[PDB]
Design a protein around this ligand. Structure first.
Ligand code: GDP
Length: 1749
């Protein structure tokens, strides 16, 4: 029986796979049992036969037992590493019950074997546990069966570390049994090197650690993160025995205690900055922390602490002075000793929350920014809060404490802006009159027995949230209504609050109300159900004394000559008609209706302002404008014309629906007396239903696009017998009262000011009627009427906007809201005036001497229009009006085109212009009816567009997704045009287009329409797109009725294309046509479409509807779909466009690309087919517009287009490797303060954005959506040319100023690193920004980038006039001065100034005398006067020198006082004092490496040089006095009668040749001293008397050369010597008025130009001047010779107010400072970034190279 198995094994050993297959299948046929089948399955797994495994499991259905035995195929496959077999076997198991037992077995066995791939697949895909035991039933666990232990024991490092990193954890067994490789892995892979190796061993669950594991790297850092484990003790060395630790994370473990140090001298780690010992069992902090003078953060949170420290109240604790943050929350602290909190001085945040604290610690002076003391048992608060923390403490929370009252100081905090006192036993507040907390943004007083509550007035302009819910509040505190800036109020959970006072309606920005458990008597329950917004609106209505307005607007509509005026007459009078009605196009009147008996209406009667609109058919198109939403419409028709009349009604009905979607429409039949009575029941009931059939769906619902007419809205009436007049007016009243906005419209509450404005406007209309004026009310005049209104509550415009809405709804005002160029600034007062003026201008029957083919000269038109105003003062308005209605359009500036004056078809040469060519495309529009004036408007608009395009070839554009459209796709020079009333032929180079009304008769549907034909010899068919956009826009604007179907679904307009194949076959007949819908829908997918007459000869779409295929574009722009790896997966979505498109992450030709794709379909059915076709047409049009726009953009900062494709409809753009600027900026801004991306890089980003905006605006392209989201970052490397590009996708009136505003916003987000967080609701943000609120960025002192801050603040100025243009911004950023000056700091009156090496006293000033002598210390990095006029009595000083820890101070009493830095501020007691033969003028310190000492050379007022040896900052008394005169008489032998022996003061001192020598000044000459022998060795003569060397400077070059620069005080010239050869190499006259690109050779207002000092800044030399202009110079190599040149000229003009430069100095490796003095001896410090050759070079390279693209 078993022999079969052996055979199969033989079949595999011999390689006979086929024999194995057959034998195995036969054995399976015999082996029915599950056990036998599993035994068989073990065989191909043993071989590793993936194929036979698949056959066996797929066909024979062999089960895989989960038993982890030797016979298990999965165990065998894992044993031999056949990973594919492993996954196949595991996949075969059904259900979700993954065999974690078997998986763990395979894991452990593979780990023993080393088949790492099986392990990787087991854990990462199947989740085998790395920490379990692989132990069979009736088997005992051991450690060798644990995965990680065996992995390490096997010696395979890769598998072991993989397990450790992906779930496996250490244990005592690993650490004890195999310590060596364990320590190896720990010391090897978890090292973040930087020595400073930040070793992270957390989350490994180390039971213990040992110094032996990392003491070998205790030189700087052993390890930092030791958290997430069960440590119960630490080595004695951590942290104290480890010198350069900075931040330890010892939290999250069993460290109930810590080791310590016996004394501070044992703390080798004096520079630790952060300690986290949280989530531990600490009862007390170790005392050792109190010795860390450098510690910055300490978070001993989430502990069982009972005391902050042990009671060592005798030790002079020195540490924790600079501790800025202390988190001791989640503890059992009852007392916080005032001792150590007082000891802390830099403390900014005390998180003592969640403790047993009953007495808040005593207050002390320290810069607290927050105090989270919540969840304690505090009884009272400190009373010095407004004394110590007056201007520092911002966030405060003493909520849920044992408080009964608070001191005034709490509410006198000026910096306080978040206060949370909820959950306490507060009964009353301090009086508001003594409050000075003007920055309160949130104040929660909930859960308190307090109820009178009163607030300060200023709180109305600062508060944003207030929460008074759940208090002793039976009445709303009246002061609450005063908080206009409030946004969120909680008044709920107040059962005794039985009213909501009306004054709360004044709360302008309030939108959220907690109305829980409140009964509001004064508000209807319906309003309460509607919600808080309804409540506030109703309360505001109550406040403004709103009246019930019973006036409504109704319009009578219908075909002409149907007795509209008759119907109105019987409705008004209720009698037989009497009036003979005239020719007026419009009549206006008034009518009141009493409520019929039995009425349930809310009013006694209703009032109606009535417009009866009629007139000649020519004005019908314009009359449709008078229709408005929220009005009654009565459509009247003659019953006698029956079906015929009913048909026409659909037209009218659509017109009402297109303009008044919420209109109540009645349909009434007249001439009831003309129908035989006996048949009326049959005749009416039919016709009634018949008209319903013309407006109702087959299901009975409303036909889409039609008004909601129902059975109850129909009525019949007579005029002679007046049958049903009572019924008709009853119906009118019932629907009127039934109509609703929300409440019913009739009698709705209207604010009193609105009604007063209505009466004022009516009075103005009547005045103009009496004065024969023109019914044109401008915004100014409407505002004036508003101002003259008594009881006027309109303060902001939005109130007037709501008022205007009310007036237009009521029928007082007529408005046409077009915002183009201030066109909206008009309102109309009388329909009669408007209609009469329009009719008069229409009726200009100008002869051929007047209208020159439709255009009348401007002066002639002005004269012709005299009769209805048309004075010059109002002229513009009329044209602004007339252009809107398209009655007269500007033509150049020469004439005006009047569309109704187009000539008939002239007998011109249409044949010659026509091209009998094969590049023919034809389209045909079929129209059920032709709207009146359609053709004139269409032809006029298209002619205007052609003229505009002709002008453009020598301005309303857009960018990104928008509803703004422009036919940029048609850029064609126009050669010649023939145009007439019903068509036009327009010819251009290479072809033409033609439109003409045609007798369209497809399928015997003889109706209106047009034929359009396009020819272009180059296959450029943008003309057809032009025609289609004009058609779509015109129909949408002026004739919306045509974008609709009949009630049965028959479309009113269709568009066909004639088949070219059928025409060719014929070339009469109804040539077989394709419906445009199926054309476009098939063009989505296919390339060929089958004609019904030629089912076996499909025709290409490309020669049928080429506009869809972009056949006009260049060939190179097309993509190849086979080369496009497109992915529609959810993870491949890069973003979303503004048009519903999607930006996918794809690859083209292997390069990553962003494909913008259009998704057209939105789920046989004709209606769905039409909807899909329309959507496809829209998406194609937007595709074409976007493609044409993007194709014309070529700039280094605009996302370029790669190519396009049709199947699917999508195109490709270059992809951003680093995503958006928002991404990188957000992730870098978290851990910094300002300029997160760096100085140079941030300047680069700003310049790139400015260049992109300038380029876009130059092309008349407007962005409108400039955000960090749309900016795409490619490289943060400053050396690359391009770093960012502006994209058209993210991840009302617009102009360049809006883009510049958004640019200022982007600049703010760049500098701050935070978004302009004015809120999370956009409406509130917009309201704040419009009203002058802006987000806060720090002062220049902390930004350090002044000039761009100036630009950024200038960008969002409330007035667009002051907002700069993009070009000027680019020009500003061109100059290096834009991004070299950082800021300025004004120090006021002073007496002396001293620089430093940058170690301590970065800058210091001195003032006063004797008792008043004081000093000011300025730190440039923070821009703060860290010491402010600290007293230091004594005699004033001429020079100083600070080195090591000692400051030498040369007083004018010929004495040098040596102080130590260890005295901190009061350096009044000198450590040494040394006499001098004369007052020292200057100092120099030169170290000696061979001696570990320093030499302080003191340059005297006589020219002699004193040598003070110094050892570790300790001066020695063994001075020497090198005599200049001795050196002269000995060597230089200058005659005594020379001026050179005048005892010149020593001005200049510098080290030369790496401190080998010292060079100093002596009159015109220089003297060089040996540093080894101290003998004066050399003299040099750069200048001649009366000159003198004011300074000497030496620095290293990029070539390794060392050279010395020296400046003359008088000649104002700079000379350059070489250090070792001692020859003058260069002479440069510096007093150049305009030193632009000055160049001078180098050998191998008159006071403004005076140089003051020479500064060595990196590899460049900075020469500042009195005039504030500083020149930076370097040198370059040309053909071996050298040449010194100006690299840049800098001058911060904003330093002019601070007078003249008194001096300058280099104060840091990257910073330069200068001091400007005014006439009052008040100084200002102006600081420039310390750029070297590299920084200037890269800045210039960036600007120039971008300029060269
Ligand atoms: N017999 C009869 N004639 C009517 C009825 N309604 C209107 N008319 C006629 O309609 C004419 C007035 O139409 P008209 O006011 O010019 O309509 P308009 O073009 O909208 O102004 C009158 O001469 C009436 O004879 C009706 O119910 N019965």
């Amino acid at each position: 029986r078993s022999r079969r198995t052996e055979g199969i094994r033989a079949a595999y050993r011999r390689g006979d796979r086929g024999g194995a297959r057959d034998l195995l299948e036969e054995a399976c046929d015999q082996c029915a049992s599950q056990l036998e089948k599993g035994q068989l399955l073990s065989i191909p797994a043993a071989y590793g036969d993936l194929e036979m495994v698949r056959y066996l499991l797929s066909k024979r259905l062999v089960e895989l037992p989960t038993e982890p035995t030797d016979d298990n195929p999965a165990v065998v496959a894992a044993y031999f590493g056949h990973t594919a077999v492993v996954q196949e076997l595991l996949e075969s198991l059904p259900g979700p019950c993954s065999p974690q037992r078997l998986l763990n077995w395979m894991l452990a066995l593979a780990c023993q074997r080393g088949h790492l791939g099986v392990v990787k697949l087991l854990v990462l895909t199947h989740g085998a546990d790395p920490e379990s035991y692989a132990v069979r039933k009736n088997e005992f666990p051991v450690i060798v069966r644990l995965p990680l232990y065996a992995a390490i024991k096997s010696g395979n490092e890769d598998i072991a570390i993989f397990l450790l990193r992906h779930g496996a954890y250490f244990c005592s067994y690993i650490l004890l049994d195999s310590p060596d490789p364990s320590k190896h892995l720990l010391r090897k892979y978890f090292i973040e090197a930087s020595t400073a190796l930040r070793v992270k061993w957390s989350h490994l669950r180390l039971p213990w650690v040992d110094l032996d594991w990392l003491i070998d790297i205790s030189c700087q850092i052993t390890e930092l993160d030791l958290s997430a484990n069960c440590l119960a003790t630490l080595p004695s060395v951590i942290p104290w025995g480890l010198i350069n630790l900075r931040k330890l994370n010892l939290s999250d473990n069993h460290l109930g205690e810590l080791p310590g140090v016996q004394s501070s001298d044992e703390i080798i780690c004096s520079r630790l900055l952060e300690i986290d010992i949280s989530s531990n069992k600490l009862s007390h902090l170790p005392p050792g922390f109190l010795h860390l003078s450098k510690l910055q953060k300490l978070t001993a949170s989430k502990n069982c602490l009972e005391k902050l420290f042990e009671e060592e109240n005798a030790t002079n604790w020195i540490g924790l002075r600079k501790l800025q943050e202390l988190d001791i929350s989640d503890n059992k602290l009852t007392e916080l000793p005032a001792l150590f909190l007082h000891s802390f001085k830099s403390l900014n945040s005390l998180n003592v929350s969640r403790n047993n604290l009953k007495v808040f610690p005593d207050p002390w002076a320290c810069p607290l920014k927050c105090c989270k003391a919540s969840r304690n048992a505090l009884e009272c608060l400190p009373d010095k809060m407004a004394v110590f923390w007056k201007n520092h403490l911002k966030d405060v929370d003493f909520s849920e404490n044992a408080l009964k009252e608070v001191p005034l100081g709490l509410f006198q905090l000026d910096a306080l802006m978040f206060l949370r006192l909820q959950g306490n036993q507060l009964a009353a507040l301090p009086p508001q009159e003594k409050w000075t907390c003007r920055q309160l943004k949130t104040l929660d007083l909930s859960r308190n027995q307090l109820g009178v509550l009163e607030f300060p007035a200023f709180l109305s302009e600062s508060l944003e949230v207030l929460c008074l819910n759940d208090n002793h509040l039976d009445t709303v505190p009246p002061s609450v209504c005063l908080l206009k800036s409030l946004s969120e109020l909680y008044l709920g959970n107040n059962p005794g609050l039985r009213e909501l006072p009306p004054e709360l309606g004044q709360l302008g920005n309030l939108w959220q109300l907690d109305t829980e458990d409140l009964t509001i008597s004064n508000v209807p329950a319906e309003i309460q159900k509607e919600g808080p917004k309804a409540m506030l609106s109703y309360l505001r209505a109550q406040l403004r004394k709103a009246e019930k307005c019973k006036l409504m607007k109704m319009i009578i509509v219908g075909p002409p000559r149907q007795g509209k005026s008759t119907l109105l007459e019987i409705l008004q009078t209720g009698r037989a008609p009497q009036v003979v009605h005239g020719e007026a196009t419009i009549r206006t009147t008034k009518w009141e209706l009493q409520r019929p008996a039995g009425s349930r209406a809310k009013v006694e009667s209703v009032e109606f302002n009535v417009w009866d609109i009629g007139g000649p058919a020519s004005m019908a198109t314009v009359n449709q404008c008078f229709f408005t939403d929220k009005a009654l419409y009565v459509v009247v028709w003659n019953l006698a014309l029956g079906e015929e009349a009913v048909a026409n009604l659909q037209f009218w009905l659509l017109n009402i629906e297109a303009k008044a979607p919420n209109a109540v429409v009645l349909v009434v039949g007249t001439h009831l007396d003309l129908i035989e009575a006996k048949f009326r029941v049959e005749r009416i009931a039919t016709l009634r239903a018949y008209v319903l059939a013309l407006c109702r769906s087959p299901s009975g619902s409303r036909a889409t696009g039609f008004p909601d007419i129902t059975f109850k809205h129909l009525h019949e009436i007579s005029c002679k017998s007046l049958e049903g007049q009572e019924g008709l007016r009853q119906l009118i009243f019932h629907v009127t009262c039934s109509m609703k906005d929300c409440q019913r419209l009739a009698g709705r509450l209207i604010p009193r000011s609105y009604l007063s404005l209505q009466e004022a406007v009516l009075a103005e209309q009547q005045r103009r009627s009496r004065d024969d004026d023109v019914q044109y009310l401008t915004d100014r005049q409407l505002e004036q009427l508003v101002e003259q209104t008594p009881d006027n509550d309109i303060k902001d415009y939005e109130d007037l906007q709501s008022a205007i809405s009310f007036l237009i709804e009521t029928g007082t005002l007529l408005h046409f809201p077009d915002t183009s160029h201030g066109l909206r600034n008009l309102y109309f007062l009388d329909p009669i005036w408007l209609s009469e003026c329009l009719q008069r201008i229409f009726n200009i029957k100008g002869s051929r001497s007047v209208a020159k083919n439709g255009v009348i000269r401007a002066e002639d038109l002005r004269m012709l229009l005299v009769g209805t105003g048309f004075t010059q003062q109002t002229e513009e308005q009329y044209f602004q009006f007339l252009a809107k209605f398209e009655i007269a359009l500007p033509v150049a500036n020469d004439s005006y085109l009047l569309p109704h004056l187009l000539p008939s078809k002239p007998g011109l040469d249409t044949h010659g212009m026509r091209h009998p060519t094969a590049n023919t495309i034809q389209r045909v529009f079929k129209m059920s009816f032709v709207p009146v004036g359609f053709w004139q408007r269409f032809i006029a608009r298209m002619l205007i567009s052609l003229a505009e395009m002709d002008l453009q070839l020598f301005t309303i554009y857009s960018f990104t997704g928008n509803q703004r459209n422009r036919c940029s796709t048609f850029r064609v020079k126009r050669n010649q045009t023939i145009y007439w009333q019903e068509g036009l032929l327009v010819t251009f180079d290479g072809g033409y287009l033609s439109v003409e009304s045609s007798d369209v008769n497809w399928k015997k549907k003889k109706s209106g329409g047009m034929k359009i034909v396009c020819q272009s010899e180059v296959r450029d068919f943008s003309a057809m797109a032009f025609i289609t956009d004009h058609v779509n826009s015109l129909i949408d604007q002026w004739f919306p009725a045509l974008t609709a179907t009949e009630s049965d679904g028959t479309p009113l307009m269709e568009q066909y294309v004639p088949c070219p194949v059928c025409e060719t076959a014929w070339a009469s007949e109804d040539v077989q046509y394709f419906d445009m819908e199926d054309c476009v829908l098939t063009a989505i997918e296919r390339d060929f479409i089958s004609c019904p007459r030629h089912p076996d000869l499909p025709v290409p779409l490309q020669e049928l509807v080429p506009e869809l295929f972009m056949t006009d574009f260049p060939a190179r722009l097309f993509l190849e779909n086979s080369k496009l790896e497109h992915s529609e997966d959810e993870g491949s979505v890069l973003g979303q466009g503004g048009s519903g498109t999607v930006i996918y992450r794809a690859r083209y030709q292997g390069q990553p690309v962003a494909v913008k794709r259009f998704h057209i379909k939105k789920f046989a059915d004709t209606m769905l087919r039409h909807l899909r076709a329309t959507d496809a047409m829209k998406n194609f049009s937007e595709f074409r517009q976007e493609a044409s726009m993007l194709h014309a953009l070529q700039h280094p900062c605009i996302v370029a287009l790669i190519g396009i494709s049709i199947h699917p409809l999508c195109f490709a753009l270059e992809l951003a490797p680093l995503s958006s600027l928002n991404t990188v900026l957000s992730e870098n801004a978290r851990d910094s303060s300002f300029i997160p991306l760096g100085h140079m890089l941030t300047q680069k980003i700003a310049y790139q954005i400015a260049s992109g905006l300038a380029y876009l605006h130059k092309k008349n392209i407007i962005f409108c959506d400039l955000k960090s989201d749309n900016i795409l970052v490619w490289s943060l490397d400053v050396k690359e040319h391009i770093n960012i590009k502006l994209s058209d996708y993210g991840i009302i009136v617009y102009d360049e100023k809006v883009d510049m505003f958004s640019y200022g916003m982007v600049l703010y987000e760049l500098l701050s690193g935070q978004r302009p967080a004015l809120g999370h609701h956009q409406l509130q943000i917009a309201k704040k920004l419009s009203k002058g609120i802006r987000p806060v960025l720090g002062q220049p002192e902390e930004v350090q980038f002044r000039r761009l801050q100036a630009l950024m603040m200038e960008c969002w100025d409330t007035k667009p006039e002051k907002r700069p243009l993009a070009l000027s911004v680019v020009s500003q950023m061109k100059d290096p001065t834009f991004a070299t000056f950082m800021y300025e700091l004004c120090c006021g009156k002073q007496t002396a100034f001293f620089s430093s090496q940058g170690q301590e006293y970065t800058v210091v000033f001195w003032d006063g005398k004797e008792e008043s002598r004081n000093y000011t210390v300025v730190n440039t990095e923070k821009g703060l006067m860290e010491v402010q006029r600290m007293c230091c009595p004594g005699m004033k000083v001429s020079c100083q020198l600070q080195v090591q820890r000692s400051l030498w101070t040369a007083t004018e009493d010929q004495k040098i006082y040596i102080y130590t830095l260890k005295g901190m501020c009061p350096l009044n007691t000198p450590q040494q004092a040394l006499d001098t033969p004369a007052v020292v003028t200057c100092f120099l310190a030169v170290p000696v490496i061979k001696k570990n000492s320093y030499l302080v050379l003191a340059g005297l007022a006589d020219g002699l040089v004193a040598v003070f040896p110094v050892v570790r900052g300790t001066p020695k008394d063994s001075c020497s006095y090198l005599c200049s005169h001795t050196a002269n008489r000995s060597k230089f032998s200058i005659a005594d009668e020379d001026a050179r022996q005048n005892p010149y003061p020593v001005k200049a001192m510098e080290v030369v040749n790496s401190g080998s020598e010292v060079w100093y000044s002596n009159g015109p000459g220089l003297l060089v001293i040996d540093c080894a022998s101290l003998e004066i060795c050399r003299r040099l003569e750069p200048y001649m008397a009366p000159s003198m060397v004011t300074s000497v400077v030496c620095s290293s070059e990029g070539r390794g050369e060392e050279v010395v620069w020296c400046l003359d005080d008088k000649a104002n010239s700079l000379v350059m010597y070489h250090s070792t050869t001692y020859q003058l190499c260069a002479r440069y006259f510096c007093g150049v008025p305009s030193p632009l690109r000055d160049m001078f050779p180098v050998r191998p207002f008159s006071q403004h130009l005076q140089a003051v000092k020479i500064l060595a800044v990196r590899d460049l030399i900075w020469v500042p001047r009195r005039g504030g202009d500083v020149i930076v110079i370097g040198l370059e190599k040309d053909s071996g010779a050298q040449r010194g040149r100006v690299i840049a000229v800098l001058k911060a003009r904003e330093l002019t107010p601070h007078g003249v430069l008194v001096d300058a100095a280099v104060v840091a490796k990257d910073t330069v400072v200068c001091t400007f003095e005014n006439e009052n001896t008040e100084w200002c410090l102006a600081v420039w970034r310390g750029w070297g050759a590299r920084e200037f070079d890269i800045f210039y390279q960036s600007y120039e190279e971008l300029g060269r693209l």
